[PDB]
Design a protein around this ligand. Structure first.
Ligand SMILES: CCCCCCCCCCCCCCCCCC(=O)OC[C@H](CO[C@@H]1O[C@H](CO[C@H]2O[C@H](CO)[C@H](O)[C@H](O)[C@H]2O)[C@H](O)[C@H](O)[C@H]1O)OC(=O)CCCCCCCCCCCCCCCCC
Ligand code: CLA
Ligand code: CLA
Ligand code: CLA
Ligand SMILES: CC(C)=CCC/C(C)=C/CC/C(C)=C/CC/C(C)=C/CC/C(C)=C/CC/C(C)=C/CC/C(C)=C/CC/C(C)=C/CC/C(C)=C/CC1=CC(=O)C(C)=C(C)C1=O
Ligand SMILES: CC(C)=CCC/C(C)=C\CC/C(C)=C\CC/C(C)=C\CC/C(C)=C\CC/C(C)=C\CC/C(C)=C\CC/C(C)=C\CC/C(C)=C\CC1=CC(=O)C(C)=C(C)C1=O
Ligand SMILES: CCCCCCCCCCCCCCCCCC(=O)OC[C@H](CO[C@@H]1O[C@H](CO)[C@H](O)[C@H](O)[C@H]1O)OC(=O)CCCCCCCCCCCCCCCCC
Ligand SMILES: CCCCCCCCCCCCCCCCCC(=O)OC[C@H](CO[C@@H]1O[C@H](CO)[C@H](O)[C@H](O)[C@H]1O)OC(=O)CCCCCCCCCCCCCCCCC
Ligand SMILES: CCCCCCCCCCCCCCCCCC(=O)OC[C@H](CO[C@@H]1O[C@H](CO)[C@H](O)[C@H](O)[C@H]1O)OC(=O)CCCCCCCCCCCCCCCCC
Ligand SMILES: CCCCCCCCCCCCCCCC(=O)OC[C@H](CO[C@H]1O[C@H](CS(=O)(=O)O)[C@@H](O)[C@H](O)[C@H]1O)OC(=O)CCCCCCCCCCCCCCC
Ligand SMILES: CC1=C(/C=C/C(C)=C/C=C/C(C)=C/C=C/C=C(C)/C=C/C=C(C)/C=C/C2=C(C)CCCC2(C)C)C(C)(C)CCC1
Ligand code: OEC
Ligand SMILES: [Cl-]
Lengths: 176, 51, 243, 137, 97, 102, 153, 335, 51, 51
């Protein structure tokens, strides 16, 4: 029932084309990156505080020294990626900012979808597409998918409207 | 067929809701003429705030 | 002879058969024995597009073009009867075969010129009194040039002729008179000219070869814009047999 | 809202005579329909030839009539074209070609009547769905 | 002026009955014993100047000409429209279930 | 369609490319449609129709054998398409055929 | 006229887009006059009705039904097997009151044109020249205020 | 000279370079430079491409009417399929650009370099005496690039069915994928979003918890970040106070107190989850799709009782029926 | 009737003065076709400078 | 035509303005064709000349 909610927003609102949603995924995906990359960096920059291979036991629950080499992690990423952290306090706040800010942007976009104030079309594109029948972008392609979604879904997805769409009025490509 | 809300007017309606419905130039929101809005016209309100 | 695998990927499959420099003889016509073409083949070499003389009418010529597609140009497996006429002339009448190949070429500017290179419903004719087909025994006639895109084809906004949208649905409240041409699809049908002039004969096996030159219009995109005039030069190969 | 024997009453032959199937026959036919038909006739259509469906009306205007037990059963032994002017048992599953279509070897006269019944009962249940394709899914 | 020949064709006999000169072959299935053998013959044998011309198809058996006579009331004839005949669309116009 | 009286060799599809038969980028005669990507396929049932330049229009016109027709029908209706819960066909198919290609 | 103007989807705040800037007049254009109520009929004389567009839909099909809601006519996508095309049904349109008052149209393109518009409710005459409108719906001040304050809150 | 080649190898392997050019780097750096340069030029000025091989060119570059959101580098033609199409395989560049030539040049060069990029993430860790496995975490996003750009095309039989290099083009890839595969109803995908959602969740969890349990060393009107110096001996946050808080949020034993067990979980969850989502696309590349519950629940008579699974199917049909308009000639989409 | 100096070209003439009179796309300043400018086309020149 | 085109004041660099931006085609427009030489005459047949 949530999957249809996604497909609905695609078909009717063209939600993927919304800049606020884009910031959203950028926050979640990038947040899921920070989670991964930070976890992996620490576990592979650890100091040796035990004689076993399973270094999990070799951790001091009562603070004291840093359990992983912050200085080594810095020099690593500075040479493989070119940029690297060097302030755990900033590093961790950044891990708060990114995904929280993202979810908030995605929210604003939905708030606009309440009034149906969507990011559906690009007027400059439509105007050319109307006059010129040979002009085609991946954007135009997507709108045709929306039309199919709306037409084929609406009847059973909005029963209260008592929709009746004759076979001949159903938008279809060739063969399919 | 061409009222304020068709012309993307955002501040104008809030002035009409509370009384100011006329202009120094003679016209009025209701569409009347010969009316005398006095000082408190749309111009007047705009004037006041600037001051 | 070569098997399939001996041709695959070499481009040889898009090549009409050739005769040796020797085969320059002549094939006899009984005129009381029906003849047919077991295999006509057309291989394009050059695609010329007559350029629009701008507003300034200055007489226009044909300009060479780059083949933006690949080796998919050749026409093959063409067949039909080669009936002998009362005047002793010969007329080929096509029945069936790979009689069309969609071609797209680019120009100086960069404009892609798509065309439907074809010889559909070909009716080529020769000189009167031709007891034997000698070298250079010109074949001349017309053919039909159907619309590049067929009825069911839909434009990027869903509009089409036999199917698709009625107008520009992306602009629900726009004036339509301007969009008329782009909303209403038209199916083009025109004639073409072609001339097959023999260069190599072979009375023994009865297979002629040579060069051709054809003229036709290019794609008009369901009548959205004017078509370009195209000239097409290449080589051909015909397999004549009694049957 | 149930599969009454009122629903399982389908025409036996051309001369109006009818037959009443049982819930055992229906299920068995339905199972046999999946075993040897569904591959090409899923949901009453025809993947290798969409022009001809398993609608009762389509089977009625067939030649001979194939909108009854006798009709369909004959078809499953000696299948013909829609006009019947040509036998197609060589490129279509049937009893007289079970060597070519192994699925048809097991099938007995009892199985043929069940499958036939299935084709006549489904549209009684599904309606337009049984005939049409993805449009009615 | 610009017009859609297909939509315009639907305002004629075509769109009311089976057009022997335009309508796609699959349409002959809605009547008894017409589709496989006969419809092939009808379509293959050129256009017709009148409905009755279909009876003149060379080779037709006595029974076939009998069937045709019966279904004549379901036939009509209009000008051959290129858009509907070109590309072999009368054998397959890209329509299925 | 050929049995319905269609000339497969000269049939023009929507794009004007060739409903049934077209050419590969190197000139070989191949099957039309989205199947243009699979022109590299070789198989016992299909080879006797192939010539020195690909699919021969003459063998296609009258050398088609019944065993090939039903072979094509078989393999067509048993494409390697299915769901995790084993429902043969496209993701939009209906439950009936329990199958997923090995 | 004013009362008729409210019964037009081009004044529905739920139509429009986030970056469809400007007043509502940059869209359908400056409303000039009421063309009038369109009454659709078919050969049998039956009065048909155009199924109106829900705010949810950017684009909507043209479908005509009778009082009982039975589909009598429509504008087909695939013509190959159309049963309800305006041509086959002889759909005509008559107007009462307004610009087109007392007039009747029977040529299919013109009829389908007005049928295409009836989708939006009452049909009006717009001035698209002046403001160089693009024919794409935009939301009212009511919409924008609601949007801004819902976000701000 | 101690020996030219010996010096060369010492320079390559040198850990004193601003950017560590490794042995994997010797392959990475050139391949990535070719990929990027070709991309930038393509995205801006490349001419329309006949993606579906149906002589229906699709423009996706800026100079040809696109913007950033719509613009894309279009996949090679479907007439090419899986054939290798380098520049020297075309009669001209005009032909090469029409058949989506650049696409292959980019994806091959990217995937190669990005693999070497993973290889380098091992090498530098070796030269610096730190533990490996950082590259193993990067294997998850890379495996997704591989699945989307290489595996799916191999499975489907053409590179034209690979994900386009652009914003909207990616959206097209998804919508269609959903139609042909019902990915939302596939376990591997669901595990992916679980990893991604959870990832973002945990990223915020840890982030907040740590930054909230920082030891005070800053003024009231001074950045709390300055309370840390690069190269500290002791910790900058109270992990025991953090555990104390989070342990009371849910319940003690459902809370981490081991920083190493914490950061392992922080790395394991998203990497494993994305690993499955990458395997999902690689699995549905051979048409082993998501669950098909169409017409499952039916009533006592045989009537079909719809579920949300059926409503999803209607949306899916709409995508299928409309995607690639003029590309299909036959009933079943087996390509 | 529509040469470079009519289209407000400023750099283009300086490139033609010293030889470069062709484009990779096929056209040429003199108005010829089928010509092969080699690498040093207007595109080529523009490319070099950027590098 | 080219020769005739040079005998047109719209190609004279001494025409124009400092803030008249763009190519020369934004002015008189893109030249399409030469309408031809205009010969002026009066009732007496005398040929006149435009200053
Ligand atoms: C981090 C995580 C990284 C993950 C990396 C995963 C890499 C997986 C790639 C598999 C290796 C491919 C080797 C192979 O099995 O190679 C073979 C495969 C498949 O080749 C196929 O070979 C086929 C062979 O034909 C066969 O099939 C035909 C019809 O299918 C006929 O039946 C014919 O008779 C029969 O011989 C056809 O030629 C196909 O067109 C062709 O694609 O190569 C392919 O496409 C691969 C495409 C080339 C890229 C490989 C580069 C490797 C470095
Ligand atoms: C690359 C892919 C991608 C990514 C990363 C995202 C990312 C996002 N999408 Mg998304 N989307 C995509 C593609 C993508 N989208 C596509 C292709 C479509 C189709 C058009 C959509 C359609 C779509 C819609 C329609 C919506 C999103 C939304 C969102 C955002 C919120 C998700 C979230 O955190 O829910 C978290 C949701 C919550 C309500 C959090 C509170 C939940 C409580 C705290 C949990 C309680 C659990 C309980 C204790 C346990 C009991 C449960 C029991 C079973 C055990 C997020 C930014 C949503 C959005 O923007 O919202 C603002 C939204 O509505 N997406
Ligand atoms: C919020 C209060 C508000 C509201 C509701 C309106 C409403 C309106 N204004 Mg208006 N306006 C306002 C404040 C407001 N105004 C202010 C403060 C100014 C002074 C600058 C103006 C100046 C102004 C002019 C000059 C005009 C209007 C016009 C209009 C009308 C057209 C609507 C439009 O163009 O929307 C367009 C809306 C958008 C394009 C939405 C923009 C949303 C942005 C891009 C989001 C940014 C996100 C951010 C960057 C993310 C970063 C965060 C991240 C780092 C976390 C409409 C009635 C027009 C008019 O009169 O109609 C005839 C007109 O010409 N307005
Ligand atoms: C000096 C070298 C030079 C020359 C002769 C030209 C010549 C030309 N350019 Mg050009 N251009 C140049 C450099 C030059 N360009 C550079 C460096 C750039 C990069 C920014 C461009 C970018 C460019 C573009 C993008 C375009 C042109 C175009 C053109 C053509 C139209 C002419 C035009 O619009 O003039 C306009 C001239 C003016 C408006 C004069 C401005 C004078 C200013 C206002 C004086 C300022 C005084 C100062 C503020 C006082 C303060 C001092 C005080 C405090 C003491 C013409 C062939 C156009 C073209 O291609 O035509 C088709 C076009 O679209 N140019
Ligand atoms: C030719 C042309 C024009 C090409 C165009 C091509 C094209 C299409 C480009 C389009 C690009 C485009 C416009 C993108 C739009 C999307 C975008 C900008 C979204 C808006 C962003 C926004 C405001 C949204 C809100 C959400 C938000 C805040 C998310 C931010 C995401 C973000 C930047 C995350 C960073 C992830 C990242 C890679 C961080 C690396 C950090 C790093 C190296 C850590 C390694 C590390 C780990 C340790 O543990 C330790 C200890 C150390 C020491 C250490 O180092
Ligand atoms: C009282 C009374 C009246 C009795 C009635 C009780 C009643 C009816 C209760 C009903 C409540 C109900 C129905 C359900 C509530 C929902 C509920 C169970 C919440 C879900 C909690 C749960 C099971 C999930 C825990 C998730 C989990 C694995 C934790 C993630 C930990 C994580 C990675 C954080 C990062 C992190 C963790 C640390 O630990 C420290 C230290 C640091 C640094 C750090 O980064
Ligand atoms: C191979 C090399 C490939 C090149 C990689 C290019 C890296 C981009 C660098 C971004 C600038 C970094 C910076 O501003 O801050 C550089 C800082 C480094 O400086 C930091 O300063 C902080 C404030 O005091 C703290 O002290 C940190 O400890 C300290 O390290 O990095 C961070 O803290 C933030 C990490 C996030 C970096 C952004 C990710 C880059 C993503 C790019 C996406 C845009 C793509 C657009 C495409 C068009
Ligand atoms: C993070 C949170 C973000 C939340 C944002 C919430 C915004 C609430 C929405 C409020 C809408 C009110 C917008 C008022 C502006 C307006 O209407 O202009 C709208 C303008 C004018 O609109 C024009 O109206 C004309 C008729 O008068 C014509 O019809 C034109 O067609 C039409 O475009 O259009 C725009 O170009 C919109 C672009 C806005 C882009 C913002 C750029 C920001 C620049 C910052 C400058 C800083 C200077 C210091
Ligand atoms: C004190 C000393 C001052 C001496 C100044 C000497 C200047 C020499 C004159 C050189 C002319 C070359 C001008 C080049 C620019 C140009 O041609 O554009 C000309 C542009 C573009 O020109 C347009 O061309 C188009 C066709 O391509 C269309 O035809 C348009 O009609 C036409 O306007 O027009 C302008 O708007 C001119 C406005 C210039 C105002 C200057 C603003 C300065 C902004 C500073 C930004 C700093 C950013 C960091
Ligand atoms: C077809 C074959 C083409 C061959 C190309 C010709 C040869 C290559 C010439 C390179 C000229 C450019 C110099 C660049 C300088 C520099 O990079 O930093 C200069 C530093 C300083 O060290 C360096 O500098 C030192 C001298 S000095 O300090 O700079 O004076 C020197 O002693 C030391 O050896 C050296 O490491 O160099 C390094 O750190 C080595 C790593 C260099 C990385 C190359 C780029 C990596 C790209 C990855 C892919 C990116 C994808 C696209 C991104 C947008
Ligand atoms: C590290 C190292 C090194 C170095 C290296 C390098 C630095 C390299 C570089 C490389 C490079 C630097 C490369 C590049 C490449 C490029 C490319 C490959 C490109 C391409 C492009 C193209 C192909 C384009 C095309 C087009 C288009 C797309 C559109 C427009 C038109 C044209 C045609 C232009 C050394 C040796 C010392 C040693 C070893 C290690
Ligand atoms: Mn791009 Ca995967 Mn829907 Mn077959 Mn084509
Ligand atoms: Cl698509």
């Amino acid at each position: 029932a949530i999957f249809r909610f996604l497909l609905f927003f695609q078909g009717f609102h063209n939600w993927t084309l919304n800049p606020f949603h884009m910031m959203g995924v950028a926050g979640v995906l990038g947040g899921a990156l920070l989670c991964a990359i930070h976890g992996a960096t620490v576990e592979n920059t650890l100091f040796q505080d035990g004689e076993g291979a399973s270094t999990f036991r070799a951790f001091n629950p009562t603070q004291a020294e840093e359990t992983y080499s912050m200085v080594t992690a810095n020099r690593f990423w500075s040479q493989i990626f070119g940029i690297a952290f060097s302030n755990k306090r900033w590093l961790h706040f950044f891990m708060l900012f990114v995904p929280v800010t993202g979810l908030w942007m995605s929210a604003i976009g939905v708030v606009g979808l309440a009034l149906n104030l969507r990011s559906y079309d690009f007027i400059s594109q439509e105007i050319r597409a109307a006059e010129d029948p040979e002009f085609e972008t991946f954007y135009t392609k997507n709108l045709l998918l929306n039309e199919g979604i709306r037409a084929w879904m609406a009847p059973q997805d909005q029963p209260h409207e008592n929709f009746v769409f004759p076979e001949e009025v159903l938008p279809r490509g060739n063969a399919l | 067929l061409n009222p304020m809300w068709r012309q993307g007017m955002f501040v104008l309606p809030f002035m009409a809701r509370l009384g100011v419905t006329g202009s120094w130039s003679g016209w009025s929101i209701t569409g009347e003429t010969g009316i005398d809005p006095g000082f408190w016209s749309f111009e007047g309100v705009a004037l006041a705030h600037i001051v | 002879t070569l098997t399939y695998d001996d041709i695959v990927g070499t481009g040889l499959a898009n090549k009409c058969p050739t005769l040796d420099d020797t085969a320059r003889g002549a094939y006899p016509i009984d005129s009381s024995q029906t003849y047919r073409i077991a295999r006509l083949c057309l291989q394009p070499t050059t695609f010329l597009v007559k350029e629009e003389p701008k507003n300034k009418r200055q007489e226009a010529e044909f300009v060479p073009t780059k083949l933006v597609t690949r080796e998919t140009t050749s026409l093959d497996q063409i067949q039909g009867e080669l009936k002998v006429n009362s005047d002793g002339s010969l007329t080929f009448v096509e029945e069936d075969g790979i009689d069309f190949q969609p071609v797209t070429v680019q120009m100086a500017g960069g404009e892609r010129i798509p065309l439907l290179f074809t010889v559909k419903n070909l009716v080529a004719s020769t000189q009167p009194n031709v007891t034997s087909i000698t070298t250079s025994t010109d074949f001349k006639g017309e053919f039909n040039v159907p619309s590049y895109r067929t009825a069911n084809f839909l434009d990027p906004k869903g509009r089409g002729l036999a199917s698709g949208y009625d107008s520009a649905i992306a602009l629900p409240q726009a004036k339509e008179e301007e969009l008329a041409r782009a909303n209403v699809k038209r199916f083009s049908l025109t004639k073409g000219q072609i001339s097959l002039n023999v260069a190599k004969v072979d009375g023994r096996t009865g297979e002629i070869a040579g060069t051709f030159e054809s003229e036709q219009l290019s794609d008009d995109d369901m009548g959205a814009h004017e078509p370009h005039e195209v000239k097409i030069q290449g080589v051909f190969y015909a397999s004549i047999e009694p049957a | 809202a149930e599969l009454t024997p009122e629903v399982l009453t389908v025409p036996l032959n051309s001369e109006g005579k009818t037959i009443t199937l049982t819930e055992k026959q229906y299920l068995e036919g339905k199972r046999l329909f999946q075993y040897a038909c569904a591959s090409c006739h899923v949901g009453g259509i025809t993947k290798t030839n969409p022009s001809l469906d398993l609608r009762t009306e389509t089977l009625a205007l067939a030649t001979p009539p194939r909108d009854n037990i006798e009709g369909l059963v004959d078809y499953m032994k000696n299948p013909t074209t829609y006009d019947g002017e040509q036998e197609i048992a060589e490129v279509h599953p049937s009893l007289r070609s079970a060597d070519i279509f192994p699925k048809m070897r097991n099938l007995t006269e009892k199985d043929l009547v069940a499958i036939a019944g299935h084709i006549l009962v489904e549209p009684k249940i599904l309606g337009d769905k049984w005939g049409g394709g993805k449009v009615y899914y | 002026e610009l017009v859609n020949v297909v939509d315009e064709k639907l305002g004629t006999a075509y769109g009311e009955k089976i057009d022997l000169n335009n309508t796609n072959i699959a349409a002959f299935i809605q009547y008894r014993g017409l589709y496989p053998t006969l419809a092939k013959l009808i379509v293959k044998n050129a256009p017709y100047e009148s409905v009755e011309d279909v009876l003149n198809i060379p080779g037709l058996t006595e029974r076939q000409k009998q069937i045709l006579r019966e279904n004549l009331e379901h036939f009509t004839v209009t000008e051959v429209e290129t858009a509907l005949v070109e590309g072999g669309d009368r054998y397959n116009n890209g329509l299925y279930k | 369609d050929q049995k319905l009286g269609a000339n497969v060799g000269s049939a023009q599809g929507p794009t004007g490319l060739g409903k049934y038969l077209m050419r590969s980028p190197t000139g070989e005669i191949i099957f039309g449609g989205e199947t243009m990507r699979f022109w590299d396929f070789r198989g016992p049932w299909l080879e006797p129709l192939r010539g020195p330049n690909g699919l021969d229009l003459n063998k296609i016109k009258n050398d088609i054998q019944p065993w090939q027709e039903r072979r094509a029908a078989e393999y067509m209706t048993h494409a390697p398409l299915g769901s995790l819960n084993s429902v043969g066909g496209v993701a939009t198919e209906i439950n009936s055929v329990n199958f997923v290609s090995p | 006229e004013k009362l008729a103007f409210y019964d037009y989807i081009g004044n529905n705040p739920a139509k429009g887009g986030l970056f469809r800037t400007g007043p509502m007049n940059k869209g359908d254009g400056i409303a000039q006059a009421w063309k009038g109520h369109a009454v659709f009929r078919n050969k049998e004389g039956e009065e048909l009705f155009v199924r109106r567009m829900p705010a949810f839909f950017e684009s909507f099909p043209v479908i005509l039904t009778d009082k009982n809601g039975v589909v009598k006519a429509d504008i087909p996508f695939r013509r190959a097997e159309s049963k309800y095309s305006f041509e086959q049904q002889g759909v005509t349109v008559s107007f009462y009151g307004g610009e087109l008052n007392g007039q009747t149209f029977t040529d299919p393109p013109t009829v389908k044109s007005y049928a295409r518009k009836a989708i939006f409710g009452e049909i009006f005459e717009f001035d698209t020249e002046t403001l160089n409108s693009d024919g794409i719906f935009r939301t009212s001040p009511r919409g924008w205020f609601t949007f801004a304050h819902a976000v701000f809150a | 000279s101690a020996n030219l080649w010996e010096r060369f190898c010492n320079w390559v392997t040198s850990t004193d370079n601003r950017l560590y050019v490794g042995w994997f780097g010797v392959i990475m750096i050139p391949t990535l430079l070719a990929a990027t340069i070709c991309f930038v030029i393509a995205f801006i000025a490349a001419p329309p491409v006949d993606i579906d091989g149906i002589r229906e060119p699709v423009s996706g570059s800026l100079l040809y009417g696109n913007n950033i959101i719509t613009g894309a580098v279009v996949p090679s033609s479907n007439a090419i399929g899986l054939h290798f199409y380098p520049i020297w395989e075309a009669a001209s560049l005009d032909e090469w650009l029409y058949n989506g030539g650049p696409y292959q040049l980019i994806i091959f060069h990217f995937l190669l370099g990005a693999s070497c990029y993973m290889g380098r993430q091992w090498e530098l860790s070796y030269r610096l005496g730190m533990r490996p496995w950082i590259c193993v975490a990067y294997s998850a996003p890379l495996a997704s690039a591989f699945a989307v750009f290489l595996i799916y095309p191999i499975g489907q039989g053409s590179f034209s069915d690979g994900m386009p290099l652009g914003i909207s083009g990616t959206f097209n890839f998804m919508i269609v994928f959903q139609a042909e595969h019902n990915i939302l109803m596939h376990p591997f995908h669901q595990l992916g979003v679980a990893g991604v959602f959870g990832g973002a969740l945990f990223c915020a969890m840890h982030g907040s918890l740590v930054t909230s349990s920082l030891i005070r060393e800053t003024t009231e009107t001074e950045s709390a970040n300055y309370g840390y110096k690069f190269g500290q001996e002791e910790e900058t946050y109270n992990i025991v106070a953090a555990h104390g808080y989070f342990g009371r949020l849910i319940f003690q034993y459902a809370s981490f107190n081991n920083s190493r067990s914490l950061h392992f979980f922080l790395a394991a969850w998203p990497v494993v989850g994305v690993w499955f989502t990458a395997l999902g696309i690689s699995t549905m590349a051979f048409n082993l799709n998501g669950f098909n519950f169409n017409h499952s629940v039916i009533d006592a008579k045989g009537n079909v009782i719809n579920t949300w699974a059926d409503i999803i199917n209607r949306a899916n049909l709409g995508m299928e029926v409309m995607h690639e308009r003029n590309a299909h000639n036959f009933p079943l989409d087996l390509a």
